[PDB]
Design a protein around this ligand. Structure first.
Ligand SMILES: NC(=O)c1ccc[n+]([C@@H]2O[C@H](COP(=O)([O-])OP(=O)(O)OC[C@H]3O[C@@H](n4cnc5c(N)ncnc54)[C@H](O)[C@@H]3O)[C@@H](O)[C@H]2O)c1
Ligand SMILES: NC(=O)c1ccc[n+]([C@@H]2O[C@H](COP(=O)([O-])OP(=O)(O)OC[C@H]3O[C@@H](n4cnc5c(N)ncnc54)[C@H](O)[C@@H]3O)[C@@H](O)[C@H]2O)c1
Ligand SMILES: NC(=O)c1ccc[n+]([C@@H]2O[C@H](COP(=O)([O-])OP(=O)(O)OC[C@H]3O[C@@H](n4cnc5c(N)ncnc54)[C@H](O)[C@@H]3O)[C@@H](O)[C@H]2O)c1
Ligand SMILES: NC(=O)c1ccc[n+]([C@@H]2O[C@H](COP(=O)([O-])OP(=O)(O)OC[C@H]3O[C@@H](n4cnc5c(N)ncnc54)[C@H](O)[C@@H]3O)[C@@H](O)[C@H]2O)c1
Ligand SMILES: Nc1ncnc2c1ncn2[C@@H]1O[C@H](CSCC[C@H](N)C(=O)O)[C@@H](O)[C@H]1O
Ligand SMILES: Nc1ccn([C@@H]2O[C@H](COP(=O)(O)OP(=O)(O)O)[C@@H](O)[C@H]2O)c(=O)n1
Lengths: 255, 384, 295, 255, 255, 255
RNA sequence: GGAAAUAUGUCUGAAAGAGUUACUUUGAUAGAGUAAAUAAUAGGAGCUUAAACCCCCUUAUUUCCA
């Protein structure tokens, strides 16, 4: 079981992060929803009971993440699991000859800052936090998990910045896994496909329905509960490390 | 002798005739039991191997089997037997082997019954002290050159007076001197030593120099014969070493070095000649000193090993200081008492200073006549 | 105690100039009956303690030098060291060790066997035993650092034998992690009698070309008191083909001791296995023994 | 929980397959062991209990696999899970110039037959039985799980045939997942790294120790129970499909 | 340049192998077509010129490949390049519930034997003759190129056997590259996508046009001359080794 | 050939960029070294000849890249090829427990900006410039090549930021390739391994010897001329697109 | 046979250098830090010690003996 583990979940106020927080709290763990101030995470943290404590923070900001980690340590006294589920998406073509439109550098920079730079910042600070943990029987001090879309492997049109950030996460998953091996922290990456969440819902609904129909099997948008279950499986398994798991549903993003 | 009877029994078992040969026969004819015993057998080497195998007597092959020479240990006594041969062709006939002999004095072969079988009147040559060559003397010289030296040694050992030399033999030797250069230097050195330790050594050496054998042997053309004569007179009856006389003849150390290199004699004799030449000119007794042997004693003390003691004794023999030589014999190198630890106790740590102080104390001890004590030396030692 | 007084008497006599007293060496003196032989032991013991004092002096000097270097860096304060433009962390020793380990594992799986038979213990003394162990360590290191390492076998090695104990003491915990096969069984059991070739300096056969389908057995032996024929005797007893290096053929050996140390042997064998000619392979022979290469 | 499931495990009389069968039977499911008749799996079936039955068969032999599947259907009347954990390993350099030795073709053919052809034969045969099932409420009729090796991605020297077989398994993972998607069967692949089992018995002990030391974390040979847990997680999650999961412990095999 | 090189091209009678042979021989090299006797490759060898010779062989059979290699050595004396382009394709679904039709194991075994076993057989047999060559500058003795397919990565429906074979080729690429690295032989793999060749022409014209329109860019079927040029580039470059190159044109196979 | 083309090579004043510029200019093309003003590119541009022209700009600066591309167009009138060989490397462990040291965020941010953001900025601007061109016979308006690293696939300890940046390049390769497919621009990636360059040659002699020994075959650090030749091959072949070529020499970076 | 020569067990060499092995996740001099082995030079003796040397015996190779 996962009873007694303390989880810090970035972007836990919605979507996959909220699903993971729900599952882990229901299993008896203790979560810390690390999300933006005006994100509504306070309502979710209150809903989930004592085991949750909303920690208003911005992953791209070092000070905010340090404050959130301090709050989590004060409340629960330790940190054992970290889940980087915070991120954004942008839809903009690199260049559009017909419209004479070029991708803005600002959007690319912001997407890198949130998806990639923020994930690395959280990873390093959380590793520092978990270093104090006493090794368990197997020597595992803690676990870190990162979400990185399948766009890192087979991206689509207008997905340059996303795909870049997610590919960065995928690339850095291994060297970090080696860096933290002596410490005793297992780093893993889940590469979800398409899921029913606000991020996807922001896009047109008809194309979302078509993409949902395009998954070989199951032919429905992945439920976030499946992502939470996979995260729990990764936490439980004491041998998974330095790997990218495609929770895709067998879908290969068409051109 | 019992060993002789055992050998006779063994060879009668073999059935091949055997007879003592050479120096042993000469000594027996002289009436003196032979110091060295040499046997000649009609048996071929194969027959010798067969009979030794059938006998069980332990065998010794001293590499002389090329000429049929073998040794057998009967009753813990080694008997040396060589196959009778002619000039290596083995001959059973004793007359032919005697003809193959070099000098008549050794040609005869004695029967084990005590009866001699001489084929060239060698026994009468020995009785008369004269020297006769087997067959044609010049032919024998042609056969082998080192023999010249063998004849010289036999003359010195046997002839009662010097100058009893056959002019034919002398002229033949002078003519054949060319061949003597080729012969190996060991045998040359051994024969030279034997001749030197022999009688009439002065006359023999003078005759050899007259024969001009030195250039072929490498001896210096000019030698201080007069000095050599004086040295021989002084050491006459004093067991001189051959190198001593050679050095007396020699004038410079490096010529002796070249002569050694030619002969390849032991380095001990090299040093012998070297320091002999050096000291005969440099080191001499100090009559002004209360003890004329004191300079030699101090020099010995300077040296390391008692080999130097024997060396200085030989030098004294060379100088003819018989009284001083005796005093040296009774005199013993006193031990220098002070050790390096005494100096260390005095308060000296630097090793080089310790050695220098030890040397200085050695000279002071010599000056004191060796009567100075260890504590006297320590008082002499200057604290530093 | 009596040993202590004897050592003090030595100090007064200043032979071996003993300076410090240790329990292990004192009990060695008590055990070492022969003082005539013990003279050299005490001499190089005091040499060892001096060397320790000189090591302390040199360590002080090196600490001074390191302080000089660090304050030189402090004064320079250049900063922008390669603009902080590096590609790897400075962890090169660990990476070298790990790569050597991977190569050793690959060789153990598919390497050419090379056997050291530690069956000469009965023919060695303490000093020879220590030299043999040191040479074995050096040879194993040279094999490890090669590009095509051998698969080293340690045959006839008694579990509790003197060689095993000394090797374990010298390797500390590395012994269990070493990538070499150490077995009680003699080399004959492990391999067919046909492929084995017992290298030795006495065998009439002369090695000409390194053969990759053969197992070369090297006698882990140090022979101070010359005992010719020991390795050849063993090879004849087991009925194993033998070979000797062509030292005469390619070098003007003249008069010298044909025996070569274990490390030189393994270096020569590695060079030959790497397709090196005989001159390059034999370069490792000590220069003193041979005047120069023939033609 | 997996109560009531029926699983057909190939090579389930030893190593990873045995651990998987142990875990599934302990959870409440029922398993059928499909290993070689001389493998001595009957003792394992007796030990596990009544919910496990040993069916002698060879994966390469089509008739034997059909007989084993028929026996499983007769005993339990259903096949919801198939696990392919039966294989062999061959170490032989492709060509050794020094020794003048060339990799034998018989070894390569045997390795392919046992691993790749065996896995595909089991997959195609069990596809019919799983299709016979009435689709679950979610839709899936059953799950097929394959065993592979990290050699499929980076195989060390003297591993040509094994790497070929496992790379074939990896390649065909996705095509089969798409082929069986219409009939609601999920195909997943697990690529274990090093795991203490009789397969490693071929290697020398020192080599095994070195390889274990070279695992980033945990620095040990993976226990079979971890592989069994990962298999259970794959079975439970209804969205994993057509993916290779490197259960390797972050180890990457150098030459 | 490639002047003076000797290249053994398997399946050079027609298709990609033929284009590679044409390019290499035009550049001044020498080729040895190695295709089945009934493939009519002797006519192509005659057309190419005196430099090219036809060696009828079956890559599956060891004796046939040995005879072909001996003939090539006799005719030229060296084998500086070995291209493995021989292969066959079968489109058969793993299981079709609607029609109750199961993939026949015979087709799978035949496809594996022709593609994967054939390529490994050619590799192991030609490695000896490449080793015979004394090392040139840089210590290279030969270059072996193998033609995998994108189906090894993203196979399509009813492509289980072909994908398995190509995935096996891709998996064994690197281990062989490590096996032959000490010898000095560079092993490379090319994964072409949709190339206009006799293999494709048999497929429906509508399918061909749809595939040509499916490629992002160039929106056409790759001319075999492009493969030939890529093969030449791999040959010339002395540092490419142990890698898979996707000469596909940015096309990812349709789900 | 490549005669008459115009190539914009970022970081062309040193290392791989300079080698590519040298090769292309030798072939008759025209180049533009887009490197930092203080790098020293003006001397190289003068040395190469009238064909090569130095344009001082910073890839992270949009205005500077626009100025450089405008200069290139003015001096040559077109942009046919773009090479992104400009980047930096920073080595640092994510978190060191014994020293209590944490990876600095500024290093990560600056490495990302220089490598990934710089590459994307150059890509978009030069894509606009190329799209301003006229299509060729095959419709290829231009080519864009990006220099990733093997670290993007298997990073070493202390290569978190480098690996992140190069993995971002790898991930965004294909999405951009699909973005510009209608325009007619082919995006490709080259992942060099270890190459004798100022980045590596500056290391101690022993380190360079060890690294050279690491490469399976050849056992030497890759010459930059090999990278330039591979770039030329990619330019010439009109079918390579959206693919990552590992010009590594079969080396897989050690843990 | 008796002489006459040499022998450095990591290499140079006379004390010192280059070497060797085990540990330190090395922040750019690790170009380091803790440790291990290190026997007046074939093996044993006298003479001694500062270094030593010098000689006796034993052993391994070598050129010379009616
Ligand atoms: N939705 C999908 O199907 C899908 C697929 C692949 C990957 N992803 C990734 O999964 C993750 C979860 O997204 P989701 O689907 O739950 O959508 P979501 O919008 O519900 O999740 C994003 C969450 O991140 C938080 N967040 C954003 N920026 C933040 C910042 N700077 N600091 C702190 N919190 C911040 C938001 O408040 C929100 O709670 C994202 O990283 C997304 O890129 C999603
Ligand atoms: N052992 C590892 O660390 C490791 C790593 C990666 C992959 N694998 C793969 O995992 C699987 C499990 O192997 P393992 O580690 O349990 O070793 P194992 O030998 O215990 O497992 C192999 C099993 O397959 C059975 N089997 C073999 N050939 C068979 C055939 N023709 N028909 C039926 N059954 C057959 C054997 O009887 C045995 O039960 C293998 O496929 C292996 O390649 C293992
Ligand atoms: N055609 C494509 O677009 C495409 C795409 C990806 C991969 N491939 C692969 O590329 C290769 C080239 O095939 P192609 O497209 O030229 O088709 P093709 O049929 O023209 O070429 C295949 C060749 O293999 C030969 N061959 C088959 N079995 C053989 C055997 N046992 N011994 C000797 N020769 C044998 C055939 O005679 C023929 O010459 C094949 O391996 C194919 O699977 C092709
Ligand atoms: N050197 C290797 O072994 C290796 C291996 C894999 C990948 N790479 C990557 O290959 C590329 C080639 O670099 P290299 O190896 O020649 O090293 P390098 O430093 O010699 O080349 C980098 C070039 O980029 C320029 N540059 C740096 N920052 C810039 C900026 N902001 N704007 C403009 N120009 C800038 C530099 O002035 C220099 O000319 C780099 O991205 C490097 O990371 C190198
Ligand atoms: N010249 C040479 N030829 C062959 N092997 C040699 C050699 N010199 C040394 N060796 C090897 O190195 C080992 C240590 S040398 C010890 C030699 C010892 N006389 C003995 O009986 O072997 C030898 O056992 C032998 O295996
Ligand atoms: N140069 C030589 C050497 C020896 N010989 C002879 O060979 C014999 C062998 O020497 P030996 O010592 O055995 O002689 P004897 O002791 O038997 O007299 C000598 O006696 C000489 O007669 C010779 O004639 N010429």
């Amino acid at each position: 079981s996962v009873k007694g583990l303390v989880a810090v979940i970035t972007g836990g106020a919605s979507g996959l992060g909220l699903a993971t927080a729900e599952r882990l709290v229901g299993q008896g763990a203790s979560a810390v929803l690390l999300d933006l101030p005006n994100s509504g995470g306070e309502a979710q943290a209150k809903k989930l009971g004592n085991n949750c404590v909303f920690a208003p923070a911005d992953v791209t900001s070092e000070k905010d993440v340090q404050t959130a980690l301090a709050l989590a340590k004060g409340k629960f006294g330790r940190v054992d699991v970290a889940v980087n589920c915070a991120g954004i998406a942008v839809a903009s073509k690199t260049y559009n000859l017909k419209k004479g439109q070029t991708h803005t550098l600002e959007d690319f920079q912001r997407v890198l800052d949130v998806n990639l730079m923020g994930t690395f910042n959280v990873i390093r600070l959380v590793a520092g936090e978990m270093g104090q943990n006493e090794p368990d029987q197997g020597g595992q001090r803690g676990v870190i998990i990162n979400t990185a879309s399948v766009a890192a492997f087979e991206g689509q049109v207008g997905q340059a910045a996303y795909s870049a950030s997610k590919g960065g996460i995928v690339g850095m998953t291994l060297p970090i896994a080696r860096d933290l091996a002596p410490i005793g922290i297992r780093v893993m990456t889940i590469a979800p496909g398409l899921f029913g969440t606000p991020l996807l819902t922001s896009l047109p609904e008809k194309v979302c329905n078509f993409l949902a129909s395009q998954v070989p099997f199951p032919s429905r948008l992945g439920d976030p509960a499946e992502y939470a279950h996979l995260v729990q499986a990764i936490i439980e398994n004491p041998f998974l490390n330095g790997e990218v798991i495609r929770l895709d549903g067998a879908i290969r993003m068409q051109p | 002798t019992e060993g002789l009877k055992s050998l006779t029994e063994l060879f009668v078992k073999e059935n091949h005739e055997l007879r003592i040969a050479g120096g042993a026969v000469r000594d027996l004819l002289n009436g003196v039991k032979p110091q060295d015993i040499d046997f000649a057998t009609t048996a071929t080497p194969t027959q010798m191997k067969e009979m030794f195998q059938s006998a069980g007597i332990r065998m010794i092959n001293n590499r002389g089997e090329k000429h049929g020479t073998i040794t057998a240990r009967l009753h813990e006594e080694n008997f040396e037997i060589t196959t009778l041969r002619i000039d290596v062709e083995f001959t059973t006939d004793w007359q032919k082997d005697a003809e193959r002999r070099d000098l008549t004095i050794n040609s005869m072969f004695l029967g084990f019954d005590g009866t001699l079988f001489d084929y060239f009147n060698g026994y009468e040559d020995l009785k008369n002290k004269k020297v006769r060559f087997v067959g044609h003397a010049k032919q024998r010289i042609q056969e082998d050159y080192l023999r010249i030296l063998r004849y010289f040694r036999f003359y010195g050992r046997i002839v009662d007076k010097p100058g009893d030399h056959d002019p034919e033999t002398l002229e033949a030797i002078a003519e054949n001197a060319k061949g003597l250069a080729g012969i190996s230097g060991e045998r040359i050195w051994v024969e030279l030593k034997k001749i030197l330790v022999g009688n009439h050594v002065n006359h023999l050496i003078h005759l050899i120099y007259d024969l001009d054998v030195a250039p072929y042997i490498g001896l210096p053309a000019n030698a201080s014969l007069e000095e050599f004569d004086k040295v021989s007179k002084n050491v006459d009856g004093f067991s001189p070493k051959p190198v001593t006389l050679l050095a007396s003849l020699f004038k410079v150390q490096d010529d002796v070095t070249k002569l050694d290199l030619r002969l390849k004699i032991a380095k001990e004799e090299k040093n012998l000649g070297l320091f002999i030449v050096k000291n005969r000119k440099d080191l001499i007794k100090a009559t002004d000193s209360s003890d004329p042997l004191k300079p030699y004693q101090d020099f010995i003390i300077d040296s390391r090993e008692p080999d130097a003691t024997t060396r200085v004794c030989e030098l004294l023999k060379y100088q003819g200081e018989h009284c001083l030589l005796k005093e040296m014999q009774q005199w013993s190198i006193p031990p220098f008492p002070v050790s390096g630890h005494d100096i260390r106790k005095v308060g000296i740590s630097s090793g080089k200073e310790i050695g220098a102080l030890l040397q200085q104390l050695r000279e002071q001890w010599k000056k004191s006549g060796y009567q100075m004590e260890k504590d006297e030396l320590l008082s002499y030692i200057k604290k530093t | 105690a009596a040993t202590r007084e004897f050592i003090e008497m030595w100090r007064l006599l200043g032979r071996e100039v003993p300076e410090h007293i240790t329990e292990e060496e004192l009990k060695t003196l008590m055990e070492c009956v022969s003082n005539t032989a013990k003279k050299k032991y005490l001499k190089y013991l005091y040499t060892k303690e001096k060397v320790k004092k000189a090591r302390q002096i040199k360590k002080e000097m090196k600490a001074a030098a390191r302080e000089e270097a660090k304050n030189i860096k402090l004064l320079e304060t250049t900063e922008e060291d390669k603009q902080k433009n590096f590609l790897f962390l400075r962890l090169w020793d660990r990476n070298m060790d790990i790569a050597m380990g991977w190569k050793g594992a690959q060789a153990m799986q598919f390497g050419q066997p090379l056997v050291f038979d530690m069956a000469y213990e009965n023919y060695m003394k303490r000093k020879e035993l220590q030299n043999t162990v040191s040479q074995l360590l050096e040879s194993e290191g040279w094999n490890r650092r090669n590009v095509d390492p051998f698969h080293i076998y340690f045959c006839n090695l008694k579990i509790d034998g003197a060689l095993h104990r000394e090797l374990v003491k010298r390797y500390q915990e590395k012994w269990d992690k070493l990538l070499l096969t150490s077995t009680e069984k003699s080399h004959v059991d492990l391999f067919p009698k046909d492929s084995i070739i017992y290298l030795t300096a006495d065998s009439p056969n002369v090695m000409t070309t390194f053969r990759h389908d053969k197992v070369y057995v090297i006698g882990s032996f140090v022979d101070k008191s010359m005992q010719p024929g020991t390795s050849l005797a063993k090879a004849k007893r087991l009925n194993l083909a033998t070979e000797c290096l062509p030292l005469d053929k390619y070098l003007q050996w003249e008069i010298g001791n044909k025996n070569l140390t274990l490390d030189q042997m393994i270096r020569i064998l590695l060079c030959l296995k790497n397709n090196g000619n005989w001159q390059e392979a034999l370069q490792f022979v000590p220069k003193r023994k041979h005047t120069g290469f023939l033609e």
